[PDB]
Amino acid sequence: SMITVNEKEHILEQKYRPSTIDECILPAFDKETFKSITSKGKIPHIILHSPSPGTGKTTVAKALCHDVNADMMFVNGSDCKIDFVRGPLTNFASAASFDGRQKVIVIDEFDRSGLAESQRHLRSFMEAYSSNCSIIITANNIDGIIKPLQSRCRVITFGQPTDEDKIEMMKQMIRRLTEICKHEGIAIADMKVVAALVKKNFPDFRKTIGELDSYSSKGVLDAGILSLVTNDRGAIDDVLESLKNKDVKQLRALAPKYAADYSWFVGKLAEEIYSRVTPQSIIRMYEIVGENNQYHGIAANTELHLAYLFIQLACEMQWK
């Protein structure tokens, strides 16, 4: 196949972790800049950061090493305190690999705040040992990497594709998910649900696979799963009609019905009213719904908070 499987793992977003830089699904310019790097055979100091999780930062870190055939120490960022850098990393960085391999230190998830002291200590280290070995830092949030370490690196920024990349990357990820299903014994009844999972959590490829596990309970993905993935469980007609008619007892009665799950309902209402009302009623309807959504969760009685939203819209909406 075209796909690495680790087979020591059941957890399945980790079974399918890409082995090499090509197996990785990335923005065009980004993949190309990584090929360029593996080509020159030596690896500079690099930072990979999302801030969206699961874009492939810590996967590409291991792949880069794999492609250049580095001698690589992989390290949990939160474990890398100043005494670690002084002790084991200084050892590794000064020691000579005997097979003339680029030495590389991968510090994963290095953006914690209490490591600033370690990071500063590292700034002088990186210039001393730059001849042997390079450092690849992985971070969710850059501002947790001190500025002088960004100076020292090529900062590559993830999950920020072009409009075309997004369209291609999505196709690639759909093909991949399809392939994972063949292997896994997951039946695909409606391809539309696979395109939906991808689109739903786009930048994050980890959650996108994680999802597939949880919607596979029944070994099939059919039109019924598609309802839960897009899921709208929604027809709004009784409210939309009671709104136009500007009646209230009815609105007052419908409140408790949809208070049940609010975040979904409020969403449909925005989507559905948009089409049914005049142009400067649109701008008003976002101001009214937006504000109402905003305070939900401070508001103590949620059913009343829904009633309050209806009254507001009934009066200010002028229906085309």
Partner: protein, 228 residues
């Protein structure tokens, strides 16, 4: 199976290399540091009768001083480590191998670039001095038909410019010339006489000490230099 003083003094050593260890049945034991810099192999008195992974070596060895010098040991029904005493009994968590960075097997040592030997009497004086002299790294080169050894202070020194120490090992029969530098820190061997095996295939390069008990390999330093 039981273990004696001599055995353990070893493992308390092998601890300072890798705080964990994986070991199986035989009179052989081994560990290599997590980071890929050193490694030791050992033939020993006492006899191993089952495979087991120890996460916290440096403290298991410790627990072991907490009962008599004779208590028998084995694989518990509980697939963990049972240190059983005359009166008491301990049950030490055997860890998942996944997590104990061990060497799959044993890799042979390149028939050596260069050979010489060192008296244990001599090597005690090197360590001894190094505290006294803040000697943090060393270099073994060829000064006038003999194999010397030079201690430095990479700290104050920087370029290994000035020699603070210089044992004088064997003589040099062959006709290359080199300078193999060694991180003192990376030198974790219970003292005793050694044969010395040096090697380099250009940028490749390592160093093997051949004891009476175990063999040790340490990585040269980044600009160990030579014509091999």
């Amino acid at each position: 199976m039981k273990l004696s003083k001599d055995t353990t003094a070893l493992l308390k050593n092998f601890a300072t290399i890798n705080s964990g260890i994986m070991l199986k049945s035989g009179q052989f034991i081994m560990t290599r540091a997590v980071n890929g810099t050193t490694y030791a192999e050992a033939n020993i008195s006492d006899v191993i009768d089952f495979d087991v992974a120890i996460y916290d070596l440096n403290g298991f060895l410790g627990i072991l001083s907490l009962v008599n010098d004779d208590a028998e040991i084995s694989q518990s029904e509980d697939g963990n480590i049972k240190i059983a005493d005359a009166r008491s009994t301990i049950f030490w968590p055997a860890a998942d191998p996944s997590t104990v960075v061990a060497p799959n097997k044993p890799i042979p040592f390149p028939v050596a670039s260069a050979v010489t030997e060192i008296k244990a009497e001599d090597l005690q004086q090197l360590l001894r001095v190094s505290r006294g002299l803040q000697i943090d790294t060393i270099a073994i080169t060829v000064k006038e038909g003999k194999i010397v050894i030079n201690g430095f202070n990479k700290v104050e020194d920087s370029a290994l410019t000035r020699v603070k120490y210089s044992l004088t090992l064997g003589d040099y029969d062959g006709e290359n010339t080199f300078n193999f530098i060694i991180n003192m820190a990376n030198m974790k061997m219970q003292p005793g006489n050694y044969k010395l095996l040096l090697w380099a295939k250009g940028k490749q390069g390592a160093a093997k000490f051949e004891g009476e008990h175990a063999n040790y390999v340490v990585a040269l330093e980044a600009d160990s230099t030579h014509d091999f």
